Every structure is written in C-alpha cells, then in structure tokens.
Design a protein around this ligand. Structure first.
Ligand code: ZN
Ligand code: ZN
Lengths: 304, 49, 98, 46, 58, 287, 69, 44
C-alpha cells in the first residue's frame, strides 16, 4: 500500500555542501520517476533572463552580427527572475516590451590606436585602446519605473570577464539588447544551471573477506576514500560509498571476480546542481519542485 | 518486467485511440511469476502485443 | 483545451478512458503514471507520446470498477501535488539546519 | 604523445615571422608548380 | 615572390599562403599535372592496335 | 568556431593545419538510445547547437554590371542612383541615396539590391535578389574601370552572407568515413547522461561499426577522452603501435589513472525514464 | 574563431577563461593539465574547450580595412 | 563620407559623374562603408 504519510516517513534529504554556485545534496527513498522529473525541470523549465533581441546600430568589427548577437544571448545575467513578468508574443513591438517585462542593455565601444604604446610592443591592451570587449561593457540602462526597484541591485552579468569581441582601431560596436524571460526548452541560454544531474549511490558488496596482502591491491583499485582496512583485524571494508566513480577496475583482475560485486542503491540519489550565476542552486531546486506541483495543479483545475 | 514496466511498454506501442488495438481496451495477461512479487517475462510482452 | 478526454478511446462505463495533454513531455507523464499506479483500483495505466516533434502526451487509465477513470486522474494529480509538498518541506528543514 | 603548440600557435597569429615562413614543408608541396613556371624565365640558357 | 609572412599579410594575401595557381577573370584556375611516358627511354610495347596499321603488322 | 583535434598526426602541426581548423571535438556516445540513427543517421544534442555547436555561414558574391549592352564610347544610358520620377519610397529602407544597399541589411526574396536610373526609358529600375534563401549584405565594392578617360561607375560587387545553422538532414562525418545526415536535434533533458554530469552531443549507432570495420574511431574515442582529461595531445600517425603494445592498452591505462574505466565506458542513465542503463555506455571525444 | 561562451555539452561558462589560461601557461609555467584544473574546469567536456581552442580571430584581425598600413 | 579606399584606407565621398578613384592614390576599388542604421537580430 502507498500513502503520502508512508512516503513522508521514508523520504529524507541529506545535504552535503553549499556554495553560491554549487550545491551537493541527496534524496533518499524517492522514485527514479520523480528524481528525473526534478532534473528535467532544472534544465528545461525553470525561468531565467537572457538577451534575445539585439539591435545593432553599427558593427564594423570582424565578428559578424548574428554571431556577436548569439554571444550576448549566452552571457548569464545576474538578475532575479522574479522581478519581471512574461511577454506576450502576439502583441506588436510597440506594446510588447514594457518595463515590467524587459531589461535593456547597451554596448557602445569604439577602438582607437594608443600612441603612447612602447616601441615593439605586442600586447594589444597597450598597443590599442578598448581592444577587447568584455561582458562588463554591457551597460545596464533602467527605463521607466525600474530605475527604483533595480537601484538596489543593477543588472551586472554573472561572469564579467566573458570576452565578447575583439577590436582594431577604426572599428566599433554599438547595440541595444532587450532581455526577457524564457525556459530552457526554448533555447539553451535560458537554462540557469551549468549542469543538474544525479548519480545513484554505488553499493560495493564485499562477499568474501579480503584479509592479507590482497587488501592493499583491493584498496588501490578504487578512489582513495572508498575502501579502508580495519584495525582490529586486517580486513578491507567500505569507508564511504559516495567517493567512488564506478570504474569497475576490480573486474579486470581475476582475483576479485568472486570476492566483490558492484551493485547500485536504487533510490539514493546524489544531485549536483551548479548554478550559472543568476540564482542560488538552493533556489533552482526549490523552484523545480514548485513547478511540478503547479504543473499537476493546473491539470487538476482545467476542465476535461 | 514488473507491473509498472509491463503496462508501460504495452501502451507505449499500442495506443488505442489511434486504432492500433482491436478491442478499444488493452487486455493483459497474468504474470509469469506470482510470488514473491509479480514479474512478466519479455516473451509475454510480445504475446500481448 | 489543456486536458482533453479522447472520446474515441473512452468507455461508456467510465472505467477506461484516454487523455490527451498538450505541451507535456516525459516530465509530468512519467511522474503522473507512477503516482496513480500506486492506486489499488487502477488496472492499467501508461503514458505515450504520439511523436516527439509534436508537444503532445497521451495517458491511458483503466480501472477495475467502483471509480471512473477521470476520478483516478484527479486522485493521481492530488497525490503528485502532495508528494511535491513533502520534498519541499524536508529540503527546507535541512537547509535551515545546514 | 604529440603536443598542442599553444603559446606558439598563438604568438604566430599575433605577429607573423619577419624572416622566412614557418611550416616550410607546406611550401614544398607546390614546388612542382612554382619551380616549373620559374624554369620558363630563369635558369641555364635564359 | 620573396615576401615574408608578415609582408604577405600587409599585402592582404594570407600569412602562410602557398601559390601555385593562376587568377583568370577573378577565378583561381590551376593547370593539372598529367602522368605520361618517360622521356628518352625506348620501351618495348605490345598493343593489338599496332596490327591495325595495315596488313602484316604485328 | 573550429577546434584543433585531440587526436592528430605529427604531420598535422607540420603543415600548419592549425591555421585552418576544419571541425570540432564532440562528445560522442556509441549507443542505441534514440531510434533515429540506425542506417547512417545521427543526432545532435539540441542545446549543443543552441550554443553554437557546428555553426557556420556561407558567403556568396555576385557582380552587378551595368555596362554589358553597349560598345565603343556610346553614352551610358544607365546610371547608379535615383532619378526624378515618381519611384516608390518603399525602397529607401534597403537602398542608400546612391542606389547601393546598406551594409548589414536583411534581404529576402523580392527585395531590391541596387537602384539605377535609365535614360532610354526615363525610369528608375531596381535589380532584385533572385534567391529564395535570405541573406545579409556584408560588403559592397566599387569596381572602377581603368581607362585614359575617366568614367562613372558601371560595375558594383555585392557580397552576401547566409546563416547556415546546422539543420537536420545536414551531413556530418568523423575522420574515419562515418558519414550521415542529422535526424532530430534531440533535447538535453531527453538525452542520456553520465555520472559525471555531461551529456553526449553526438550519438552514433553501434551498428555503423561492424559492417564498416572502422576500429580507428573506437580508438580515437579512448585517445580523445584520455587526452582531454590530462590536457595532452596524442600523436596518431600510423604504425607507432605494434601488435604487442595495443593502443587499447596504451589509452586504457591513461583512463585508469584518471579514475575512468579502462575500456572507455561510462555508467549512463536514460533521460526519458531516468533509469540505470544495463551496460556501461561507450563514450569519449572524437573530432 | 573567438573563444566559445558556454561550452557545448553541459553549459558551463567557459568564455571568460581563455585569457586566464594563456596567463597560466606563459607567466605561471604550468602544463595544460594543471592549468585546466586551476581554472575550475573539471568535466572533460569543459576541458576540451580551452585545451583545443584555436583563437583564430587574431589572424582575422590583421586585415583591418579601416586603417592605413 | 560613405566610401573607403581599398588600398590606403582613406575615407572619401563620390559625387555625380565623378571618377571612381581615391583622391590620395590612384586606386580604382572603393569599399562602401557601414553607416549607422538599425538592424534587428534575434539572439539565437
Ligand atoms: Zn561542459
Ligand atoms: Zn587611395
């Protein structure tokens, strides 16, 4: 029999680490059907803000315009996706981009030759002026009422050293960029996650005891934190079944084809969520279980 | 194949609303192994296909 | 027009019925299939995509009786809601302790 | 093993050699074309 | 002819640009190589079409 | 964006082929997972070339010559630019005041590419874009005629660029004769994924190997993956290996020192059902 | 041509790591294996972006039609 | 100024019935320079 209180007893979360970008945590006694449903939302269906419409006024640089527009779209933008709503595509361009739907970014950079460069120089940062265009040169321009709600936090890119273009004197780039929401099923630039995936917990099952000098070679055929030898008797045991990459190195040696088997704990998942910069990995997983709850809630209320 | 797997492979290939079935209701078979838990052999997938 | 009962596949008794959900992938269809196969009245259940290039999703529910196939779908959507409400709480209880 | 010749591939992109060209083995691939037209004008007997 | 790969860039060509080809009407043409009988060596040849020079030809 | 290969001969860096990159290293899984890649076909990760995987352009140049219908000093009846007639103001958008198009403008079929005023008809005719695939105008040259008497322009060379994003049905290939069109840009959440977290951006069928016997692609997968882990390139000029030192043993012991499998395999999961697959899937990068 | 933002397999931001890599190969005399590990590139799909980038834009940029030579 | 000499890269203009040559060197190929105009792209 299954019940929502039977699941509430057996499920628990075992969080390993936190960081501003990466979170390592565990889900115990949950199905593969649900644990896949969480990582399929974190890649595809959790919103993020990225540049979609780029408005070139002048581009005399070497990299052409649709490629340089494509690179601005791949720049992660450190902005909270809750601060602005969705666009309506059927509206015309006069009425579609409002200040509650759209953040404006501008890039105005001109390159000129530096006459104060030393003789025989090779470094283009000294031989030229504004020779490299970075992601921090995308200046935020608040329009309308978002000069107050973004005065506490401007729209800076999450990685300000992203090299957008390279220029030589005489050349320039001048553009505007309207960045909106979107999901990772639309384009890859809206996925707020570097990677989000699980590995199941390996289960190293020592069948027969490996006492003796074969316990230094059985220990060698794993990552170093996986197998330790016992002190009271010389005996290899499992210290941590998490640290192993499942390499099956013991199956190459005919000595260990009877004494160990490599299974897998079928419900102990290890999520590894790495944020692209816009949100915390705490918040992406928290949204992804809220998206699946609202997704079933939408079908529950729609008429059949 | 367990019961969730067994009924997933049949509806993934039959799909009665496109008229591949001839009964308007997917019929199944009893499992090969009853105890300890039900399992269907993969011979029996193509039997009910 | 999100959920739609396929009239050519339903039964007159209401025990057997197919459903067609627009713009849903394996994400919801596999999770909803697992939760309602936990119901001790569902006889048959499974999901199917007619073609991957079209954002459609069919789901069969057949039951033994004493419940219609729509009433099984409403229970499985309620219990997939509550399953996402306990993985939300215990992830919050462990991120507050940390 | 081979090697990625980075910091040499990159330096040769920045400033090309003011002396003779790198990769001389590529210039020997067209010497049956280049040196054949050079025999029409130069060499013994004009 | 004797340009450095620096000087081939400043004359717009390409750095490690190998020549070999003619430019004709803006199109880069190339006369191919033909493999052909060796010079100055008499090679004994059997061909049935040597018999078709008339009568009694071997 | 080309790349230099992990697995390359020593003659590659000797002919300067780094000056001319002809491809890209791709995480290639040899797996039957999809159903769309059997005979010769192959799939790409959808979010791979939403990021620019294998993107390329095409440049096409046509010469607009206005002086091929006359001879021997007769006066030119066709001048570039606009005239004084009532010509429609619709094509100020694509064209400049001199009857030449702007740089960077998007031109589909039916749009004008140049305007010229005529004298025997006293009307501004435009020449239009006679191609059904849309382009962008990259550069406009002015080919002036060389003569002792100086002449108004009659020849203009216009170059287009066409975005060839890799659609499905485009042929990719390996360096071992494994050609095949693309079937479907398979979405990232539907692709298989390893324990390391990566996903293969190319799937090739394992049935393209037994009849073809391209074992050089199996060993480029080991040599490619064992080189990206340690940050080294391996020479692959032929007959550097004997029958006693097999490269399955050479590149196998490099993958064991990194912590990966000796035989080049990785434990992978399904993207659809999320289950552990049966056998460890054979992956690695090839060019 | 120029360094790819956001590598092709997982989606890790990679395009900010080209100028640091050439700094960590020339000034800090490291091999390519240590320099890819110090920049935070652990997965081998991320490692083959900065290891095998040609950076061919520097050969393009010496043809500047907007300045005398 | 809407044109660039292909040889000496000096920017120039070109009036009606005017000879196609740079005013600083006798070079017959002019490059049409890029004037500031809106070109709308979708960053994809
Ligand atoms: Zn990656
Ligand atoms: Zn000039």
């Amino acid at each position: 029999e299954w019940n929502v209180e039977k699941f509430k007893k057996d499920f628990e979360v075992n969080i390993s680490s936190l960081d501003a970008r990466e979170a390592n945590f565990d889900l115990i006694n949950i199905d593969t059907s649900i644990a896949n449903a969480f990582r399929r939302i974190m890649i595809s269906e959790v919103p993020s803000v990225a540049a979609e419409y780029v408005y070139f006024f002048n581009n005399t640089s070497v990299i052409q315009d649709e490629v340089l527009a494509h690179r601005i779209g791949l720049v992660p933008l450190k902005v909270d996706p809750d601060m602005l709503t969705w666009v309506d595509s059927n509206l015309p361009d006069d009425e579609k981009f409002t200040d509650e739907n759209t953040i404006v970014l501008s890039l105005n950079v001109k390159c000129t030759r530096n006459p104060d460069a030393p003789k025989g120089s090779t470094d283009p940062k000294e031989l030229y002026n504004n020779a490299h265009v970075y992601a921090r040169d995308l200046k935020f321009e608040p329009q309308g009422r978002q000069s107050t709600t973004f005065a506490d936090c401007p729209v800076v890119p999450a990685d300000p050293d992203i090299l957008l273009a390279k220029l030589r004197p005489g050349q320039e780039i001048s553009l505007k960029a309207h960045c909106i929401l979107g999901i990772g099923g639309d384009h890859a630039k809206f996925s707020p996650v570097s990677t989000a995936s699980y590995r199941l917990l390996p289960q190293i099952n020592i069948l027969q005891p490996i006492k003796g000098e074969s316990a230094r070679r059985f220990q060698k055929c794993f990552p170093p934190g996986v197998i330790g030898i016992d002190e009271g008797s010389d005996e290899a045991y499992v210290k941590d079944a998490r640290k192993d990459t499942v390499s099956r190195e013991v199956l190459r040696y005919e000595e260990f084809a009877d004494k160990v088997k490599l299974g897998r704990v079928r419900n102990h998942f290890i999520f590894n969520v790495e944020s692209a910069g816009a949100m915390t990995p705490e918040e992406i997983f928290f949204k992804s279980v809220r998206i699946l709850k609202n997704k079933a809630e939408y079908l529950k209320n729609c008429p059949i | 194949f367990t019961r969730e797997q067994y009924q997933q492979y049949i509806y993934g290939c039959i799909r009665p609303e496109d008229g591949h079935t001839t009964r308007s209701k997917i019929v199944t078979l009893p499992p090969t192994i009853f105890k300890p838990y039900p399992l269907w052999t993969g011979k029996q997938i193509i039997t009910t296909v | 027009e999100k959920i739609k009962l396929l009239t050519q596949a339903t039964s007159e008794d209401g025990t057997s019925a197919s459903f067609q959900i627009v713009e849903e992938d394996h994400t919801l269809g596999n999770a909803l299939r697992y939760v309602i196969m936990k119901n001790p009245d569902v006889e048959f259940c499974g999901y199917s995509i007619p073609h991957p290039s079209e954002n459609l999703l069919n789901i069969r529910i057949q039951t033994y009786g004493e419940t219609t196939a729509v009433d099984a779908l409403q229970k499985g959507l309620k219990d997939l809601m509550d399953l996402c409400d306990v993985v939300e709480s215990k992830f919050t209880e462990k991120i507050k302790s940390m | 093993t081979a090697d990625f010749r980075t910091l040499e591939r990159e330096s040769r992109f920045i400033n090309p050699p003011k002396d003779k060209s790198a990769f001389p083995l590529l210039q020997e691939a067209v010497q049956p074309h280049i040196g054949s037209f050079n025999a029409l004008t130069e060499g013994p007997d004009g | 002819n004797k340009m450095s790969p620096y000087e081939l860039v400043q004359h717009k060509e390409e750095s490690d640009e190998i020549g070999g080809y003619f430019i004709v009407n803006g199109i880069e043409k190339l006369i191919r190589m033909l493999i052909v009988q060796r010079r100055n060596h008499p090679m004994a040849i059997i061909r049935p079409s040597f018999a078709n020079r008339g009568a009694s030809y071997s | 964006t080309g790349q230099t290969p992990i697995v390359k001969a020593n003659l590659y860096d000797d002919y300067g082929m780094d000056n001319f990159p002809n491809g890209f290293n791709a995480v290639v899984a040899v797996i039957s997972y999809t159903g769309y890649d059997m005979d010769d076909a192959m799939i790409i990760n959808k979010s791979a070339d939403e990021r620019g995987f294998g993107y390329g352009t095409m440049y096409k140049t046509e010469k607009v010559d206005l002086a091929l219908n006359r001879n021997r000093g007769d006066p030119i009846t066709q001048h570039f630019g606009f005239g004084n007639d009532e010509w429609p103001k619709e094509w100020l958008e694509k064209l400049d005041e001199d009857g030449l198009p702007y740089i960077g403008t998007y031109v589909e079929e039916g749009d004008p590419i140049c305007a010229y005023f005529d004298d025997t008809l006293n009307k501004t005719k435009i020449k239009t874009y006679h191609s059904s695939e849309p382009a962008y105008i990259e550069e406009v040259n002015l080919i002036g005629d060389e003569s002792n008497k100086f002449q108004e322009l009659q020849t203009v060379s216009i170059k287009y660029r066409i975005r060839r994003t890799p659609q499905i049905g485009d042929k990719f290939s390996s360096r071992h004769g494994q050609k095949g069109v693309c079937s479907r840009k398979w979405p990232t959440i539907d692709m298989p994924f390893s324990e390391t977290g990566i996903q293969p951006d190319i799937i090739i069928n394992p049935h393209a190997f037994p009849s073809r016997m391209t074992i050089g692609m199996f060993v480029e997968s080991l040599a490619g993956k064992a080189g990206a882990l340690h940050g080294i390139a391996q020479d692959s000029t032929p007959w550097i290996f004997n029958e006693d030192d097999t490269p399955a043993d050479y590149f196998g012991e490099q993958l064991a020192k990194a912590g990966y499998n000796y035989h080049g395999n990785e434990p992978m999961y399904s993207g659809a059902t999320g289950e552990e697959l049966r056998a460890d899937i054979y992956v690695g990068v090839v060019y | 041509m120029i360094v790819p933002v956001r590598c092709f397999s997982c989606g890790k931001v990679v395009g900010d790591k080209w100028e640091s890599y050439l700094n960590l190969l020339q000034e800090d005399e490291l091999d390519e294996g240590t320099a890819l590990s110090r920049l935070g590139l652990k997965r081998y799909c991320c490692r083959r972006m900065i290891l095998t980038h040609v950076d061919l834009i520097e050969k393009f940029l010496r043809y500047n039609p907007l300045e005398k030579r | 100024l809407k044109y660039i000499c292909a040889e000496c890269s000096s920017k120039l203009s070109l009036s009606r019935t005017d000879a196609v040559r740079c005013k600083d060197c006798g070079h017959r190929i002019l490059l049409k320079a890029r004037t500031k105009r809106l070109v709308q792209f979708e960053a994809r």
